[PDB]
């Protein structure tokens, strides 16, 4: 992900403000609600028969944490996402068989969650830098 210094600036500043215990669970939760096929990789996680169900569901929040955990990593290694996400690639691709389009969706949901949490602070330029990041991360996962 070829971020400019100002793109890095925008991503980093906002990201330090992120509650890493909650945002990940919100993003994953919203994915399973908005794009229900995605529930298919998570039938082991329990009750997903409603939004409130999905949202207020501990296995969802738990896993979201890791997901967001992994994303923060990629944020530190912007100049090397392929290497960073080499392990996770061969998991979702070789082990789980998830289509790459779904990574794009998670990234976009994440972006919607950031917008939701930060409101006016999530400006168009700030959004644009974050789209570059999620795109880079999705591609690295797809590799």
């Amino acid at each position: 992900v070829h971020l400019t210094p100002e793109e890095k600036s925008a991503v980093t500043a906002l990201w330090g403000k992120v509650n890493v215990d909650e945002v990940g669970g919100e993003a994953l939760g919203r994915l399973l609600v908005v794009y229900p096929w995605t529930q298919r990789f998570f039938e082991s996680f329990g009750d997903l028969s409603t939004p409130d169900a999905v949202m207020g569901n501990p296995k969802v929040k738990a896993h979201g944490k890791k997901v967001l955990g992994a994303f923060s990593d990629g944020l530190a290694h912007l100049d090397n996402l392929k290497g960073t996400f080499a392990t996770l690639s061969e998991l979702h691709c070789d082990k789980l068989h998830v289509d790459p389009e779904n990574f794009r969706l998670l990234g976009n949901v994440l972006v919607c969650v950031l917008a939701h949490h930060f409101g006016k602070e999530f400006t168009p330029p700030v959004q644009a830098a974050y789209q570059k990041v999620v795109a880079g991360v999705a591609n690295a996962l797809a590799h």
């Binding site: 919607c112 409101g119 168009p124 644009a128 789209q131």
Partner: protein, 140 residues
């Protein structure tokens, strides 16, 4: 296919947007142009800089078209026929670009309606925008 729940969610959310409709449309466009620069090639004759009267003007048209579709959610094909003809035939808009603009419209709403943008409302708006996009790409 929109459910009775989706339909009320979308109405509710548009109710909450109220008179900011035009303004949010313009902001959605700017988000799209910045995040997805290939979209700009459909507007070579606009100034796309921040505060552009043409972007503002266009966001209002886009927001009005969306409200018209909410207002006639049950017969969108007919309501949106002239617009789908414009976008598919004359403009040749790549269908992928509808996903991008839809996303930026959701981002915009999320950024402006903290209480209203619940997971259920998010899902309903996503479906509504997808249905609008389907109509707008139906005439190839």
């Amino acid at each position: 296919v929109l459910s009775p729940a989706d339909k009320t969610n979308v109405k509710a959310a548009w109710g909450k947007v109220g008179a900011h409709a035009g303004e949010y449309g313009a902001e959605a466009l700017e988000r799209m142009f910045l995040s997805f620069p290939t979209t700009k090639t459909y507007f070579p004759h606009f100034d796309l800089s921040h505060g552009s009267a043409q972007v503002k003007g266009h966001g209002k048209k886009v927001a009005d078209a969306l409200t018209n579709a909410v207002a006639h959610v049950d017969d969108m094909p007919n309501a949106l026929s002239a617009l789908s003809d414009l976008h598919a035939h004359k403009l040749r808009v790549d269908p992928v670009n509808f996903k991008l603009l839809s996303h930026c419209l959701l981002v915009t709403l999320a950024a402006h309606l903290p209480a209203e943008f619940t997971p259920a409302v998010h899902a309903s708006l996503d479906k509504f925008l997808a249905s609008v996009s389907t109509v707008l790409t139906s005439k190839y």
